[PDB]
Amino acid sequence: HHWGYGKHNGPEHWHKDFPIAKGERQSPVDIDTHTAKYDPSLKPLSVSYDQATSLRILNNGHAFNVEFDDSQDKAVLKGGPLDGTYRLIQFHFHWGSLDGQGSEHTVDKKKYAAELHLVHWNTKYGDFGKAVQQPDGLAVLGIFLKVGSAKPGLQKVVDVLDSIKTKGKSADFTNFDPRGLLPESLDYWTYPGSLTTPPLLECVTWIVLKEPISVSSEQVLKFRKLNFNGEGEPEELMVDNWRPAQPLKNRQIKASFK
Template sequence: MQQLTLVLLASFWAFCTGSGDWCYQSQFTCDHPCNTPEKWGHVFKDCAGEQQSPINIVTRKALKDERLTPFLFNNYQQMFRALVRNNGHSVQVEVPHLSTVAGGGLSTTYKAVQFHLHWGNNGGPGSEHTIDGEQYPMELHIVHMKQRYTDLKTALSDPEGVAVLGFFYERSSSVNKKYDTIVKSLKNVIATNGNTTLLPTSLAQLIPPQQNLTSYYRYKGSLTTPGCTEAVIWTLFENPIPLNNEQLRAFSDLKFHNGKPMVGNFRPVQPLNGRQVFRSGGVVILSGPALLAATLAVALGLSQPN
């Protein structure tokens, strides 16, 4: 019975295939055929490259890299008003080029350009990257480009022109008030090309506190949407952002351009192809009694005979 189902499903896809724009598996229909992720590489050459994103991170295989020090966030607390837009594939917010990141093993300073999200179906699995096979409900991408560039297209011609900071979300029993402005704006961008002005917000309020951002993974990859340009330095932070069920479900109210619910807007994980994933030292900032205890432990350790 299972084999028959697979044969019928294969026949269905063969019958329904046709030319069209790129899309996610969840928005494909026979009435509106489009190129699902497994076909992106046929239409967009780079999508079949050797350094594609997202990936599954196997934590035990990630190598510790002492160069992956804490990031230096500049102007991340800066409040701004910006346009929120349903671009037909996600919800995207263009940000003023004021906020920058440096350190964290990056070769230079990068400035924030925009952020967008990827999610599942009503709070179900939906992150693009996975950790040891676990898929989180949602993933935030804050896209940066090298400070010297004025537009993303130019930055993407540099093999390390773009740096994306990725954050996972976890389901929480309580509301995350810091996300009120984002979640409330969604009802005004239900349809593709719908846009609205975001009430004053900052990048800092969307992500965990800076002291909780010392544990992260790093690898070289690509954009996760066509054209899949391999010019991205990826950073994925371990500490997730809490949202409650209602907040997570609000994203599933958006619509793709064909009117279908915007759910499952994530690309499946791609082969690692020999790439190495690195992890930071995860420096913990101690204070008070914890610092005193750690100092004593080190002192006692040093006093032990060899």
């Protein structure tokens, strides 16, 4: 009875195997824009993906991961609310079955069609494994996706999805530049949270961009053709792989802008 997004193994069931699901700093959360406060102590955010080197794309049965070679000091996120340097390890998305839903974080209760998560680990911890055992081990840059004009830089990802339709399939995915997935503005909201999928570890400093990127209906429709199941198994479309907003509890969301 492996965790998932269905009626019998979805978000409402996760707490049984992962008690931290009802923790003190769980994600995602609704971002109440009027309650968020501009933070003057936030330093300029720095996204340096010029030397990013992708290796492979994988369908893990929950989403698809574009993995990067993080053995060297490349693709770094720093500044903003972060102390030190965080290295990019992979990115993935969460999306819906319809354009009206799909994002994990919400803005004033508004749900976007999807949400991109660029995952980075704190280099002071050596690697990802050790980093997820620390309260400041990860930094995730979240970017909302709305349906409208196509995002040229996303097409290469879209076109390779037909080769990793089912759970367990992977394909070489080199030379992909994640800079093509970033919106113009780096204005953001930040708060301490967790991974949004089991084990739901609370090691994430969230940096959610205010400006969404636009992707075409055709592009997101191809996301929805992926499968949760493995090859040779009954088809269950990979849609609505998002966790709903969780209690903000003892937290404050800070804004990088006025």
